[PDB]
Design a binder for this molecule. Structure first.
Ligand SMILES: CCCCCCCC/C=C\CCCCCCCC(=O)OC[C@H](COP(=O)(O)OCCN)OC(=O)CCCCCCC/C=C\CCCCCCCC
Ligand SMILES: CCCCCCCC/C=C\CCCCCCCC(=O)OC[C@H](COP(=O)(O)OCCN)OC(=O)CCCCCCC/C=C\CCCCCCCC
Ligand code: HEC
Ligand code: HEM
Ligand code: HEM
Ligand code: HEM
Ligand SMILES: CC1=C(c2ccc(Oc3ccccc3)cc2)C(=O)C2CCCCC2=N1
Ligand SMILES: CC1=C(c2ccc(Oc3ccccc3)cc2)C(=O)C2CCCCC2=N1
Lengths: 372, 80, 72, 59, 240, 99, 22, 186
């Protein structure tokens, strides 16, 4: 009975708001993604080996020879992307509806994002293809830009003077475990949310009109789970190599760099902000601040209205910030030549300008229009 | 935070109906498609123009990338 | 008075089988339940088909692979 | 007159006990029916190209 | 230093529910064996993989037996040769990458197991690379060991044209023309890279059918449950 | 002068289509909560229903008929006079705490 | 008494189940 | 403060009895063992490889060449035993003092024991020595005694017709995760 009572107050008769749109469905999907990555991942690790001699052979052994090994792999590989799509929806929802006003919930969120980024980055190294190796070699070396200890920090991280067998084997250890730290953090993410209750699209206290989670949001989250599954299985069964890079089917080779070098799609916006700045340290700090600025969002909030539902100027600038991110994601994918350098430069400044300068000013104007 | 301790509500009456007594899809295409359209008209002006602007910068940038990739007429012309 | 309170008209939202306000619903009730509970059951069957296959595939990966079966 | 769907409710799935027996047996049949159908659809879609179509050839 | 992207050749296996052409795979294997096997590695395929795809168990066993491969150590403590088997992976042409670059003008002929998945375009690129050999235009003066193919990134490929009209003869009695060879072998190199291809699309069909069944049924349950709230009517009645 | 564009923004905001006044949409905090607590029975029980109805609309993804929309001229600032006093008392407590 | 037909029916439901996946 | 309040009612001002002997100290030690096995274990897995070609070489690579790798290994290997000593004290205490009357606590316990037994058994296979291999080959084959399906159950567990590379690699996966299930259960 002490457990059922936790599950009651969690999932059965938790008072949810009555008017919650499908933008709140992504939280439950992120858990479904996390559990999917864990279950698929476990079954991959049952056959995968983390030695540079065998790493590639083992992944191909899974696809070819392990019974239904391919379907487990591409569910992991594309589920990783679906996790990230869901994340960027889940983060944006909070930006739009002002859900960042649950400070701790939000700040635990910001951690959850960063841990998944690290998880997925280290995961991508594991199969030991060209883009996996060279992705690590590029992205890790960035830390050497740090003032006085980066060059040491990188060699310590790697376990040597380059990305190598020392790095791959620990990257597997870190991948297999950090997901569980993520799940632990996620339960605290939920723990602060019950303290604070849940937000609704109006940004108006819905204590006057609550409804029990079950049966309403149970069946709604079930419906949404099938749409996530559909979206996964469309990718898995019809387009498993769509989001993935071809060069990672070429086995890794440190003596031969592929020409168009890049991270996966979910880091390209941040990669584009890094490339925007020419100075190395500046590029790293902008890359960092691109993610970490999320923590300043609740301090940058100005409007007397919580939600953007009743805020035109903010809505337009929000939808500008989305388009600007999709611009940066595009630019990060393309090589560093004209005209993409200047587009990337403007897009990167626009990104920080929307967040830091404009959207606060918009909220302040929006107040003055309504006599606030 | 429980049902019973949420807030003070007074003088409201809520009339409801059993899901077996009522329909699941009442006037779906009849009333919905207009309501969907109305909602689209409300948001479109705020939502679309940034994505249009993305599309313009996208095609232009790719166009200008293909222009710069290709040959140029000053490459050793009128110069034997 | 509280007798001023009549229940608003649900004739818009009602099913066809309960629209006549001079008619006992009990004859339609079993059909109305049977329709909705059929949807639920059909869904559960459809998921049960899927769930069986998903599980069976993961179980099969854990079983003996092709290359081991080949060189046995 | 007892109707079409009510006749199912009344005797097949009023109890939750029989509800499950219906689902289980229905799912047992559905699996045979659907797989067989969707296999045949896929095999007609891809006529002559699979091994089973060209197996008699080399055997 | 310019790109030439391949065109959209309509393959037998192009569409969402469209399977591989197993007879074309059958011929495509023979094209590897006869033509590509002497220079190119295919490390992640064995003769048992052919069984039930393009060949029978007995036919596939005979082809394994044709070639001879190493095995050991023996009781004396040394290696010996034996005729191949179903479990043997396809013989690698050289013992290492340095022997390849020694044998072929300092150029490594890559592994053809994943080549379709490894390159942009896939079969369209591989087909256009094979059939699309042509003469170097005015200005393009290539060096020793090199040939002009436009679809290759650098325009100067280190591979001699590998296939030409009737370089081999097909067992089923098919006209072995250059583009017919290219078609068949690309249909095989698809299968080498993605052997799951047929089965995966069948799962695809079944998934689309089943999602088509369930999504409305689940949505109906959601609507059935939420109906209570969606039809409800709020009446305010304060006192005086 | 710009009462025009103020009235435009009001209509463009859209809370009036749900039958909400401006002060129904104010973000709650310690001051607003306190001001809302100070409200007399009538104004409290009214905002309760106005919000309860607006959420019910927001659930169904609909708005009120055009005549029932809140008017920029008839948009009463019921919460302000209380909230001003709560803020002024907090400012006083802070100014006294300063010394 | 009354749970005999129910437990028998659930006994059948469970039985076919073990046949269901295996 | 809804975390601190959990930690208060857990560890700060939880009302304990006044007269508790040192037999109740083993509960906290079992957690310290579990955390020790996790932290040592993680650092071993950073260098360990689960292929039959490399498994032995990797463990010896740890001891010999990984800086302070030996001390991490033997802390894992002997900590495993210290965990078990502590368990058998922790179980016996409850048998003696009647603590099994907290049924659910006790029955969760019984699970915790079994999971650790499985964890440590699969852990012992990992270095791929004679006694590790032959321990698995003996102990696993016992399941073939099951009346109708044991012979299948064993081959499924192994991933083949004997203890092999299929078994070793999954035993690593199971070994490195089940400790977290143990902590969750705990
Ligand atoms: C690029 C992919 C984005 C596709 C989604 C576009 C949705 C279009 C849309 O409906 O916009 C209008 C609509 C109007 O809603 P309300 O203001 O609450 O009023 C309801 C009136 N009935 O706005 C929304 O749905 C807001 C939802 C915002 C979430 C979108 C997040 C997209 C991703 C961004 C990355 C995150 C940043 C870091
Ligand atoms: C929720 C489930 C929604 C339905 C999912 C559709 C796929 C279900 C299904 O049955 O697919 C077919 C099945 C195999 O069928 P055959 O190739 O004929 O193999 C032999 C079958 N005995 O393959 C799949 O699609 C399984 C994929 C499952 C995806 C769901 C993963 C759930 C994640 C949590
Ligand atoms: C030598 C006697 C060869 C025969 C016969 C074939 N190939 Fe080849 N190939 C060869 C070399 C030396 C190289 C490297 C070329 C370079 O300059 O890098 C290749 C390369 C390929 C490639 C890769 C092209 C790329 O994008 O890198 C492909 C796809 C390829 N070869 C295919 C191929 C096929 C299908 C053949 C027979 C059916 C074939 N090759 C024969 C050397 C030789
Ligand atoms: C948030 C959770 C996770 C994410 C986002 C994630 C992401 C990834 C990604 C992107 C890859 C590379 C896929 C590819 O292109 O091949 C990968 C590989 C892998 N992951 Fe994960 N992963 C997660 C959890 C797990 C877990 C929990 C395990 C084990 C318990 C696991 C085991 C593996 C293994 C063995 C590989 C290598 C095989 C392969 O490349 O497919 N992963 N992961
Ligand atoms: C593993 C990743 C994540 C999981 C599993 C997770 C889980 C959840 C869940 C279950 C909810 C409640 C459902 C909902 O309202 O959507 C929720 C809400 C929320 N999450 Fe997350 N979350 C994740 C990532 C993040 C991130 C990255 C952020 C911010 C950077 C964040 C901030 C929030 C906020 C602010 C809410 C409140 C939603 C509301 O307004 O009602 N979360 N999260
Ligand atoms: C309850 C927790 C644990 C127990 C009882 C346990 C027990 C064992 C045992 C008995 C061995 C064999 C030691 C030997 O003689 O060589 C072993 C090996 C190993 N364990 Fe664990 N283990 C635990 C947790 C972990 C965890 C959490 C990880 C990783 C996160 C891990 C990774 C390893 C590795 C890599 C080896 C192989 C290296 C070696 O043999 O020392 N273990 N474990
Ligand atoms: C607590 C909570 C959950 C929720 C439900 C189940 C969760 O756990 C799961 C994790 C993985 C899979 C399934 C459920 C997590 C959050 C929601 O969806 C919502 C959706 C909107 C109302 C507020 C809300 N509150
Ligand atoms: C809650 C509790 C713990 C205890 C202490 C630490 C715990 O967690 C750990 C903290 C640090 C390391 C390992 C475990 C868990 C339970 C005890 O020992 C005791 C010992 C006897 C009094 C009752 C008691 N109650």
């Amino acid at each position: 009975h002490p457990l059922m009572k936790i599950v009651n107050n969690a999932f059965i008769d938790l008072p949810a708001p009555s008017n919650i749109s499908s933008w709140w469905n992504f939280g439950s999907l992120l858990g479904i993604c996390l559990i999917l990555q864990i279950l698929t991942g476990l079954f991959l690790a049952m056959h995968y080996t983390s030695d540079t001699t065998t790493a590639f052979s083992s992944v191909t052994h899974i696809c070819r020879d392990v019974n239904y090994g391919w379907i487990i792999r591409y569910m992991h590989a594309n589920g990783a992307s679906m996790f990230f799509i869901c994340l960027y929806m889940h983060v944006g929802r909070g930006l739009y509806y002002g859900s960042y006003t649950f400070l701790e919930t939000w700040n635990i969120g910001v951690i959850l994002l960063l841990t998944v980024m690290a998880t997925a980055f280290m995961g991508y190294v594991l199969p030991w293809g060209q883009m996996s190796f060279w992705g690590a070699t590029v992205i890790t070396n960035l830390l050497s830009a740090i003032p006085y200890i980066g060059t040491n920090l990188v060699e310590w991280i790697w376990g040597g003077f380059s990305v190598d067998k020392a790095t791959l084997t620990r990257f597997f250890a870190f991948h297999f475990i950090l997901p569980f730290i993520i799940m632990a953090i996620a339960m605290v993410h939920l723990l602060f949310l019950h303290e604070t209750g849940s937000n609704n699209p109006t940004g108006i206290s819905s204590d006057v009109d609550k409804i029990p989670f079950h049966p309403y949001y149970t069946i709604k989250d079930i419906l949404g789970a099938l749409l996530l599954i559909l979206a996964l299985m469309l990718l898995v069964l019809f387009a498993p190599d769509l989001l993935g890079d071809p060069d990672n089917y070429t086995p890794a080779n440190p003596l031969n760099t592929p020409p168009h070098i890049k991270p996966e799609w979910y880091f390209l916006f941040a990669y584009a902000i890094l490339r925007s700045i020419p100075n190395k340290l500046g590029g790293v700090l902008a890359l960092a601040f691109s993610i970490l600025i999320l923590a300043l969002i609740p301090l940058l909030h100005t409007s007397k209205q919580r939600s953007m539902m009743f805020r035109p100027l903010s809505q337009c600038l929000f939808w500008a910030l989305v388009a600007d991110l999709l611009t940066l994601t595009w630019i990060g994918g393309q090589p560093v030549e004209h005209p993409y350098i200047t587009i990337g430069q403007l897009a990167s400044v626009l990104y920080f300008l929307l967040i830091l300068v404009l959207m606060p000013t918009a909220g302040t104007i929006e107040n003055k229009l309504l006599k606030w | 935070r429980q049902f019973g301790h949420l807030t003070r509500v007074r003088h409201v009456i809520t009339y409801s109906l059993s899901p077996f007594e009522q329909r699941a899809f009442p006037h779906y295409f009849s009333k919905g498609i207009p309501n969907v359209l109305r909602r689209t008209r409300a948001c479109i002006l705020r939502v679309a123009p940034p994505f249009v602007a993305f599309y313009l910068v996208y095609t232009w940038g790719t166009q200008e990338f293909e222009k710069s990739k290709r040959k140029n007429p000053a490459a050793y012309e009128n110069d034997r | 008075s509280h007798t001023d309170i009549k229940v608003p008209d649900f004739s818009d939202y009602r099913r066809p089988e309960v629209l006549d306000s001079t008619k006992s619903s009990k004859e339609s009730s079993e059909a109305r339940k049977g329709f909705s509970y059929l949807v639920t059951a059909t869904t559960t069957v459809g998921v049960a088909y899927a769930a069986k296959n998903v599980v069976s595939q993961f179980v099969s990966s854990m079983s003996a692979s092709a290359d081991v079966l080949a060189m046995s | 007159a007892p109707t079409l769907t009510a006749r199912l409710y009344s005797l097949l799935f009023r109890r939750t006990s029989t509800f499950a027996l219906t689902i289980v047996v229905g799912a047992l049949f559905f699996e045979r029916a659907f797989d067989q159908g969707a296999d045949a659809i896929y095999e007609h879609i891809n006529e002559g190209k699979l091994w089973k179509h060209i197996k008699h050839k080399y055997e | 230093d310019l790109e030439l992207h391949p065109p959209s050749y309509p393959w037998s296996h192009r569409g969402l529910l469209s399977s591989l052409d197993h007879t074309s795979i059958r011929r495509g294997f023979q094209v590897y064996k006869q033509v590509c096997s002497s220079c190119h590695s295919m490390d992640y395929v064995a003769y048992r993989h052919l069984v039930g795809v393009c060949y029978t168990e007995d036919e596939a066993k005979a082809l394994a037996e044709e070639v001879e491969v190493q095995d050991g150590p023996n009781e004396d403590g040394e290696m010996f040769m034996r005729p191949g088997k179903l479990s043997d992976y396809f013989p690698k042409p050289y013992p290492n990458p340095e022997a390849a670059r020694a044998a072929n003008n300092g150029a490594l002929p890559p592994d053809l197991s994943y080549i379709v998945r490894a390159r942009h375009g896939g079969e369209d690129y591989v087909f256009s690379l094979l059939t699309g050999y042509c003469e170097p235009p005015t200005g393009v003066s290539l060096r020793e060991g090199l040939y002009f193919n436009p679809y290759f990134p650098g325009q100067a490929i280190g591979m001699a044209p590998p296939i030409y009209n009737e370089v081999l003869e097909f067992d089923d009695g098919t006209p072995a023309t250059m583009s017919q060879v290219a078609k068949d072998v690309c249909t095989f190199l698809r299968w080498a890279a993605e052997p799951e291809h047929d089965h995966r699309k069948r799962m695809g069909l079944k998934m689309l059918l089943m999602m088509g069944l369930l999504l409305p049924l689940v949505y109906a349950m959601k609507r059935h449950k939420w109906s209570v709230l969606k039809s409800r009517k709020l009446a305010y009645r304060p006192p005086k | 002068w710009l009462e025009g564009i103020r009235k435009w923004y009001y209509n463009a905001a859209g809370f009036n289509k749900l039958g909400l006044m401006r002060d129904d949409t104010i973000h709650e905090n310690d001051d607003v909560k306190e001001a809302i607590r100070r409200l007399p029975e009538n104004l409290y029980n009214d905002r309760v229903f106005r919000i309860k109805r607006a959420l019910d609309l927001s659930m169904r993804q609909q708005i009120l008929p055009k005549e029932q929309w809140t008017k920029y001229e008839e948009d009463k600032s019921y919460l302000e006079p209380y909230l001003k006093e709560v803020i002024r008392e907090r400012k006083e407590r802070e100014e006294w705490a300063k010394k | 008494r009354n749970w005999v037909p129910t437990a028998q029916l659930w006994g059948a439901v469970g039985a076919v189940g073990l046949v269901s996946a295996t």
